[PDB]
Amino acid sequence: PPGGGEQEPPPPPAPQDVEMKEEAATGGGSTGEADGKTAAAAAEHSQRELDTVTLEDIKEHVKQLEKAVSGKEPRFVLRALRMLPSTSRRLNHYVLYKAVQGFFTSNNATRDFLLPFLEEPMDTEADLQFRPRTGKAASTPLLPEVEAYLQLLVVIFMMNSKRYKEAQKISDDLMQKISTQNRRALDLVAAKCYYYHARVYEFLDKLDVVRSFLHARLRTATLRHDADGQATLLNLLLRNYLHYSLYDQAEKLVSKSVFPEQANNNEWARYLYYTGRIKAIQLEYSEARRTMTNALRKAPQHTAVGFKQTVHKLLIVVELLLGEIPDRLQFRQPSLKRSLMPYFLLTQAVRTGNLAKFNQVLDQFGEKFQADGTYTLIIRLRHNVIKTGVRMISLSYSRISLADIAQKLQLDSPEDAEFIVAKAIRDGVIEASINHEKGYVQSKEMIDIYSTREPQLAFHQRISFCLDIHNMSVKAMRFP
Amino acid sequence: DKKFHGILDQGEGVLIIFDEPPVDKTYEAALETIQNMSKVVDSLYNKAKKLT
């Protein structure tokens, strides 16, 4: 009781200090300015809701003795939130439940008491037509149930809480969704709950009847609103279709839903990456690396970014497949350095011409590549090792025996050492001829490449590109 | 020592002599502008990147 009564009594009110200022300012705003007048294309309540997801990601950790959040639920759920003269008593009810935690004891919600914390939208003239309240009054309890996820006989409490929000989601899909942004501000509440709808299901449940419900969700999308409904319903469509073998990739080629034209700078950034791996996994190399690069330089400024630990790995998988390689550790971190050393040792073998050096990696770190889920692209680098090597040898040696190149590439056979060189010319790596009767492979010396048209093609790509950024500097300037 | 330029042969001693002032003015006096302009964009960080 002294170790309790000095360390337990400040966890109730100082969260009550900041929760009368963040979602009470959201409840004070997004009931009267999302159901109210307007929250326009330049709104604040979405970014305010962006402020009330991230803060509560790392806010709550403990099982909430002293009712420091276990008493917030009997406070924040007895809410009509209809109009100002009936919420002037509710502005007292933000303080009337504070002494319920203090003078008395509330109901400590420890893994059992969430069932009398969900049935309240009948109590004291509550509604569901005001879904700028009730979609947020879903998400204000729907987040902290599932934020820790706590995975011990809880899943049904998360489910029935989603079912009441799914009842709000059907009223979203059918009933009066126009110019109140009832779809728009709840497409985020659709999108943000889907990740809590998935990590439940990616933990212990199925995946696929939600997909047909998501097709029914994609049905009404772009069918009433063409803003942030075309965007988040397609990355959340793709998120396990890539990991499944279902058709889902040539569908997304001819699909019209490729461009929502705006997706709020962070869901748009990874959007070019989930379809960036689709061209990577189905052999479309050169088209992929520009939507892989564009999916990199549109991401914000966080540090614990473990998906960015994957895109920097994957972006130069396909560039090893094309030949080009940048320095990958050019932004090396204390958390990037350990995530590069097996994969950086791979591209060490690619810039060399050795053949079973590839085999000395693929037995040492063959298990690591299957953890990242990338092995099926790794296995085909032996075509690109041998074309790197045959370009390397033919440029160095001019008149080399074909019964010498195989011993240097440890090919163990001169009789197909002619044959890779045949496919080197069929692909077009080296030009010159082979004296198959003698055995030497002669190469012609290069000639005046300066007086060829091809450096103008190095220019014309970049003349037209540099006039574009001068035009974009004009088009983005005179907003005043 | 580059006081004269040419080539020497080892088999029979043939001195293939050639000359051209190739070009120097056009490229490297335009190349150093690029690294001057790189430092200008670096100095844009001290009035834009810090500021807005």
Partner: peptide
């Protein structure tokens, strides 16, 4: 190619010359 490269940098320095006159007056004037 050099002269067009200069054209992009100059208008970019002009771009900050409008971002100095956009943000530094909305708090001042309103």
């Amino acid at each position: 190619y050099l002269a067009s490269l200069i054209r992009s940098v100059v208008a970019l320095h002009n771009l900050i010359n409008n971002k100095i006159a956009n943000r530094d007056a909305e708090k001042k004037e309103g």
